[PDB]
Design a protein around this ligand. Structure first.
Ligand code: ADP
Ligand code: ADP
Ligand code: ADP
Ligand code: BEF
Ligand code: BEF
Ligand code: BEF
Ligand code: MG
Ligand code: MG
Ligand code: ZN
Ligand code: ZN
Ligand code: ZN
Ligand code: ZN
Lengths: 368, 334, 333, 360, 358
């Protein structure tokens, strides 16, 4: 059929749906329950954490026909045209088109008008940090006191660019990036709700791939579903992301540590035939090396994942002193930086590994 | 512009491909300053916009030829920065792009020449990407640059890269001797300072810049035996910091070659100065000085609006500090 | 003519108003007070109304010239105030002023306000035309050396007793901002009718409103006052001054100082100053800077200035004030 | 069930209800009672300091049936019409909205016409420093000789951009940013009158986070009440302030100096949850170290920009030898140099902090 | 209607695309399964197929034979999209059109129903070149576009795109084509076009193109343009200015023993022959790597260069691995710095002379 995109179809529509952001959820629900509704809100967070969706949910809650309820209550007319994107009380304004004060003034002189079939005229000024200082000070007066029927919802990614004066007259709510476990939980919810078979390893890899937002996780999950045939597998997800099997990179770093050349050559020329980009091989090795360095820092830094090779992480941490780890990481980092100017990418990776071997702190290559 | 004798075979190697009908729509010519790439671009454009060619050459008084000579050919395109600036903006190439969509006014080819692709702003390059990749029928492009690597990767990906090999050193020396009359050592110095470009050697000789080189040589004759490199300030800070710094770095390079004894050096006109530089300076100090001079020349060429005088003064003070014993000298790394 | 100071114009005005008054100076407060005194004396002597005209490339010279021959229907006498531009007059404005000078009569208490004119503007036909009886009043801002004496004298004039510490604090907070300084004196007089403005009594009623130019910071560096230099940097940054001009003046005078220090071992400081065209008032300061600063310190200052300019000119311009403060501290050791 | 915003519901109505700015209030009262009021009053303070409140109270004092005085009356016609925002001739102008010289000229054509009510036609322009130079000159020209019943009120957050000549025309007042004590006491009074359960430590945290502005304190109080269901405890305010915390670079420097690996890891993970760019974090860490070095060189190197965290900065300057500062600066510089080619920069910044901690 | 190799051999079906199977499989399965996103960003280096894959997706999406993963190529919509004359496929260059009025033009254009095709498709090239104004104003139209609007993005570097732009689009990373894939594509193209070729010339062209097929085809066209339309080893070597292992090996053995006379004379002779300094440094690094290979394991030695293995083994035996690594690093740094030198020859001389003083 159509299968509307996961982000579009599975956008939250109730405070019982939004995962994470417990602070802003509690604030909105409790304030609506107590009836202390501020006229100016500032949702600030990284991309894809839920500022727009939570703002739409708050607008739904304010203008439910049944009454003023914490969550969007029984979805009446107003709520369902809100969720359809149709206007009941949602003036969604991009700040990039109204940076000039000559347009902010036009916005302001329209605010003094009763809303149609709604209890408020909810302004959603997204990317509010993109306005100009003149525009900020122009809408300063309306922010300090708008008409009773006008509410301001400002959403932006960087609150530091905002002037302190407008920052004063706003309820500030910062939305933390979602943890990998919450992202994986949501993706599992989506795939169970869509009758698509899934593998736990694939979901874990996808959740790690997303950098703390569920929008990236959902786009990656759609890409993985497209890679499959209505299912997601470890093979499909790994091929999509390009990450190799941790056994390969881990055997390679083990052989580099043990200072044997033949094993390194065997591992690299087996990895050549697997169609894994060499730069990502170096990136994975550097990531592992920093992982052992962090294990050295604290047993806290292992990772809930990497359990299949966690024992070997701990063994490498015990065996290798931090100075050797720093030396290996510096050598591999310099090699990766030098890789574009090597004769070949495989050539560069091989020479970087051989350089780490030759300058091995404990077992250097024999010299004449 | 002007034509050069050694320059003919490359033109014959390109116009033949264009007459075969298998010529690329976007030809990127790599040539040093004074090499004569503008001559190729202009001659090829005249041939292309010519109605009936005569042996792969512009045919006298053709209507296309007449409008080329008048410089007001409707189908001819020139992209150069405004004389008050050194960059080619978005709008300059945008008007070319939007006005190229229409048919050729004379019903022939539509030839575009970008005077220097290095001067193109990255936005102008990205704008020209679409027209270079899929130009309309009978549309040809010509780009020139000192080094194609400085160009945008996707810009040069769409063009066939031709190389203008500098003429043999003996032939270039003969040409310089024919044009200007002086000692052969000066000719060799100009050629090897110009990276084998004889046109750049003519540019150096005709102007007063060669006399400034002589002034710098005298200031160095006093500068190296006494550790007074700051006095070179006035010798370097006349709106030509890249050229003077290039000459100084090449003198240091020749001294370094004199260490690891070499048959050929650049500054052959001043062997005594090279010997003084080699004898009075530690080889590692020479390495550090040459590297710092090259880095400062690069910074002067790259950054716009920078103060030449402050940079040159700092360079000289750093050289003075390097002269002192026990100083840690820089080495290129990473 | 009769060249005077603000403390002498009050005595001069009771000797009989002259044909024209020229208020020249860079201090808005002194100019305003002298103009107010002239207007009050004119009103006492019969000048009822006053007309104000700012000299602009679009000045209605016909209106003002008619005003010279504009009589007074209901009024009797009249003044005429002109506001010179920040750069002073040019050929056209000076010719218009020469004609106006030719248009003076028993009335027309011509008042001229603006910044001090140059020597070239000094040698002009209009200036010589009124050079017999006009009164010129110099209204330049007192500098750092004479500011405490000036504020003490004004406090005595305003019947306010001030301490040395309070004088220093008022000079520090409102340097180059004597309008705010007089407003602060009036505020302190109003808040405390006692008049004995102790140090705590002035510490609680002043704000950092001082205005500086890059040359103030350059002189602070040359004198070695690190605290004053940092204060000037803070005031310039709050004012929003572009750091590029600070870097430019720093570069110019630092290169001159490096040349001087290099040539010090060859030629005595007097001849070096003379050859490099060094003004007499700053020769002692620059000699002190040369004595205090070593060649190593000069090289480090040049290095830091070069790094700062490279950071600025590469379109980054991030935390340039930190580098400027670093250079300021380095040059004050 | 009003539950209105506590910001404007608690705006001062009489001069005795304004917290701080005591010298300014005394000067205004003295001018209103015995002296002749100056033809133009300019106000300059910080965000949320009281500027517009003081100007509105002064305008209320100007127009009232009791006469021009400091504490005129209560619930009068003019005082109420100002408090409701419905006053006719109390013109309220945003300077940024009317920076144009044409709009400014149109505004200055209204001074000639007599006031509709009261005695004085009061103009209240906010953020006056943003007026164009031509508009500013026109304002000065209309201020030199204003009508006998026309007065101007100007406010601006940063008076440093105002030309000096403004001092020649108007009497300026500077409002000092409130300290922790005044803000805490005012918040305590507001909560006591609103019957909001609270703890003194919560009030202290709110006041310290306010950074001198009472409007900031009121906004934070509203957020604390909203999240805490009216029960404003220390833990609630602390948690919700931690959600808004952005001093991560300073805490990272403090913990890395103290060789506290676990603290640095927790703070860097919190910064990752904040979604902060790593290059910016590292460059501001470099800036903090440079500032520590400069304030070690001379106590005057600090300014009012870091007047929020100056105590910890002074302690760091006192306790840390300059050699350690140089080593840390070099380590962070090379870390920033190597950051782009590292793996996902969340761990590159980590390992740069690791290298910094290695110097133990 | 002559067309150069690149455009004349533009992929027309999913079966004609070289490599990129990891994105082609997902694209075809999304077309077949009915799971179609509204925003696709194909990101990769030059000449890997972002525009070609985007055009194939546009063809498949709005074919009047239904949404298919295999466009017919004979239908009205397919031919019009192939020729670029289709109204519902709007091809925009972000650098050319980065303005507030152009963003408003896009925003009010996306509101009207498609004229011909099923969907109104926007193909924006070099999207990272928009202004922050344009990026932020186009956030909503990429997040929740109308039911008939689909966006295709193509950038050389996603890092310069706003991260919120990346979040709301489907990331298709196009890997740089392998040497074998590139060489097989040249072989197929030349066989289909009846052009004589030699495997060594194809290998040289594939290696010269840094994993980009458009560069490989441009170098190919240069090879046809020189040497009477034949892809021969001699012509390709002359065009690329490459040199065999003998000269580079002599240079390396001269440099490792710190023979300034020999190194300088060899560089002079190399300049006389007009060789490529970048290629010379590339051979330098390759030979140093093979030296390190022989040092690591005796059997890890090339077999083609059997004539020069005699001195190769001796040099690998007589030099410590650390010195070889230092030489490799110095030559790599010199290659990196080469474009910024006052002259290419001057820069390579700087690099080699720095390597001498070890
Ligand atoms: N807290 C959340 N709970 C569930 N889904 C979320 C959340 N945050 C983001 N998402 C996912 O991201 C999509 C877009 O989120 P959005 O709220 O637009 O983020 P933004 O704050 O950047 O505008 C949603 O459709 C939803 O799938
Ligand atoms: N001194 C004060 N007394 C009482 N309330 C104040 C004071 N200063 C600020 N506020 C509170 O902050 C709100 C906004 O104050 P405002 O005076 O507009 O600050 P600003 O100086 O930034 O213009 C007022 O409604 C009032 O609640
Ligand atoms: N995967 C591929 N298969 C076949 N030809 C390709 C491929 N990638 C690039 N090409 C060749 O490169 C030329 C330009 O390709 P294009 O798709 O525009 O690259 P880009 O991603 O950089 O825009 C095409 O005309 C085609 O000849
Ligand atoms: F609104 Be989010 F940043 F996608
Ligand atoms: F209204 Be204030 F200046 F924040
Ligand atoms: F040349 Be491609 F679009 F990167
Ligand atoms: Mg205000
Ligand atoms: Mg493309
Ligand atoms: Zn409802
Ligand atoms: Zn012709
Ligand atoms: Zn009243
Ligand atoms: Zn079809």
């Amino acid at each position: 059929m159509s299968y509307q995109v996961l982000a579009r179809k599975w956008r939250p529509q109730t405070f019982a749906d939004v995962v994470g952001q417990e602070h802003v959820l509690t604030a909105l629900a409790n304030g609506l329950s107590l009836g202390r509704i501020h006229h100016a809100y500032l949702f600030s967070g990284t991309r894809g954490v839920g500022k727009t969706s939570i703002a739409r949910l708050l607008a739904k809650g304010l203008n439910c026909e049944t009454g003023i309820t914490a969550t969007p209550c029984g979805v009446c007319d107003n709520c369902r045209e809100i969720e359809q994107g149709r206007f009941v009380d949602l003036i969604e304004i991009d700040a990039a088109s109204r940076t000039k004060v000559e347009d902010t003034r036009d916005l302001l002189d329209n605010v003094q008008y009763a809303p149609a079939r709604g209890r408020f005229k909810v302004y959603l000024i997204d990317e509010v940090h993109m306005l100009s200082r003149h525009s900020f000070n122009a809408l300063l007066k309306t922010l300090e006191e708008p008409p009773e029927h006008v509410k301001f919802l400002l959403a932006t990614t960087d609150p530091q660019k905002l002037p302190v004066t407008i920052l004063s007259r706003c309820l500030q709510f910062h939305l933390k990036a979602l943890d990998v476990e919450q992202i994986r939980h949501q993706l599992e919810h989506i795939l169970n709700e869509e009758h698509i078979a899934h593998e736990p390893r694939a979901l874990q890899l996808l959740a790690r791939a997303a950098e703390g937002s569920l929008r990236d996780a959902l786009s990656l999950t759609d890409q993985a579903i497209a890679s499959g045939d209505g299912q997601v597998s470890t093979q499909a997800v790994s091929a999509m992301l390009g990450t190799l099997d941790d056994d390969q990179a881990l055997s390679l770093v083990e052989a580099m540590v043990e200072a044997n050349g033949e094993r390194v050559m065997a591992l690299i020329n087996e990895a050549a035939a697997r169609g894994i980009e060499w730069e990502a091989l170096l990136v994975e090795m550097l990531g592992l090396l920093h992982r052992i360095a962090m294990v050295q820092l604290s047993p806290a830094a292992l990772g809930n994942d990497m359990a299949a090779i966690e024992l070997r992480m701990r063994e490498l941490a015990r065996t290798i002193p931090p100075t050797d780890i720093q030396l290996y990481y510096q050598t591999l980092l310099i090699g990766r930086k030098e890789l574009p100017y090597a004769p070949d990418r495989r050539m560069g990776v091989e020479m970087t590994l051989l350089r780490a071997l030759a300058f091995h702190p404990r077992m250097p290559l024999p010299e004449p | 512009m002007r034509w050069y004798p050694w320059l003919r075979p490359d033109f014959e190697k390109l116009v033949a491909s264009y007459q075969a009908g298998r010529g690329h729509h976007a030809l990127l010519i790599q040539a040093l300053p004074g090499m004569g790439d503008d001559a190729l671009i202009y001659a090829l454009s005249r041939y292309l916009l010519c109605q009936q060619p005569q042996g792969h050459k512009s045919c006298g008084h053709c209507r296309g030829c007449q409008l080329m000579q008048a410089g007001t050919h409707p189908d001819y395109y020139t992209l150069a920065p405004e004389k008050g600036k050194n960059t080619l903006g978005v709008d300059a190439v945008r008007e070319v792009t939007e006005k190229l969509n229409e048919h050729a006014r004379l019903g022939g080819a539509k030839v575009v020449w970008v005077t220097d692709a290095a001067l193109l702003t990255d936005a102008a390059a990205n704008a020209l990407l679409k027209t270079l990749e899929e130009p309309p029928a009978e549309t040809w492009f010509f780009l020139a640059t000192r080094e194609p690597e400085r160009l945008l990767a996707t810009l040069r990906s769409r063009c066939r890269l031709h190389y203008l090999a500098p003429p043999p050193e003996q032939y270039a020396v003969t040409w310089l001797s024919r044009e200007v009359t002086m000692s052969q050592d000066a000719l060799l110095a100009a050629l090897r300072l110009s990276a084998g470009s004889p046109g750049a050697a003519l540019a150096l000789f005709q102007g007063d810049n060669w006399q400034a080189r002589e002034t710098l040589c005298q200031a160095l004759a006093y500068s190296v035996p006494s550790g007074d490199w700051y006095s070179l300030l006035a010798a370097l800070n006349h709106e030509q910091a890249p050229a003077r710094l290039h000459w100084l770095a090449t003198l240091l390079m020749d001294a370094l070659k004199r260490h690891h004894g070499a048959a050929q050096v650049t500054n052959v006109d001043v062997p005594g100065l090279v010997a003084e530089l080699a004898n009075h300076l530690s080889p590692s100090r020479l390495q550090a000085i040459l590297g710092d001079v090259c880095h400062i020349r690069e910074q002067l060429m790259s950054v716009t609006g920078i103060n030449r005088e402050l940079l040159i003064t700092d360079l000289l003070l750093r050289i003075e500090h390097y002269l002192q014993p026990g100083v840690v000298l820089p080495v290129p790394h990473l | 003519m009769i060249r005077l100071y603000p403390e002498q114009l009050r005595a001069q005005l009771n000797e009989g108003l002259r044909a024209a008054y020229l208020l020249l100076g860079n201090d808005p407060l002194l100019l305003q007070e002298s103009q107010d005194a002239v207007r009050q004396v004119a009103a006492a002597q019969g000048f009822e109304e006053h007309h104000t005209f700012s000299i602009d490339p679009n000045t209605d010279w016909n209106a003002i010239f008619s005003l010279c021959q504009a009589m007074s229907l209901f009024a009797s006498r009249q003044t005429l105030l002109l506001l010179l531009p920040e750069n002073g007059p040019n050929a056209a404005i000076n010719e218009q002023l020469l004609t106006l000078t030719g248009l003076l009569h028993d009335d027309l208490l011509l008042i001229v306000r603006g910044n001090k004119l140059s020597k070239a503007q000094e040698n002009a036909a209009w200036f010589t035309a009124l050079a017999n009886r006009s009164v010129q009043v110099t209204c330049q801002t007192p500098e750092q050396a004479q500011l405490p004496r000036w504020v003490a004298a004004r406090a005595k004039q305003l019947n306010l007793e001030l301490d040395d510490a309070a004088n220093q604090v008022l000079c520090y907070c409102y340097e180059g901002n004597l309008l705010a300084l007089a407003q602060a004196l009036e505020r302190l007089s109003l808040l405390w009718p006692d008049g004995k403005l102790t140090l705590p009594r002035v510490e609680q009623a002043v704000n950092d409103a001082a205005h500086f130019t890059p040359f103030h910071w350059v002189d602070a560096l040359l004198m070695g006052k690190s605290k004053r230099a940092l204060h000037i940097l803070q005031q310039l940054r709050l004012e929003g001054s572009e750091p590029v001009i600070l870097l430019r003046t720093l570069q110019r005078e630092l290169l001159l100082l490096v040349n001087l220090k290099r040539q010090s071992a060859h030629t005595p400081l007097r001849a070096l100053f003379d050859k490099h065209r060094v003004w007499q008032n700053r020769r002692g300061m620059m000699g002190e800077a040369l004595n205090r600063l070593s060649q190593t310190q000069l090289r480090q200052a040049v290095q830091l200035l070069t790094r700062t300019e490279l950071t600025l000119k590469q379109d980054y311009g991030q935390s340039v004030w930190a580098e400027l403060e670093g250079l300021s501290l380095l040059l004050c050791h």
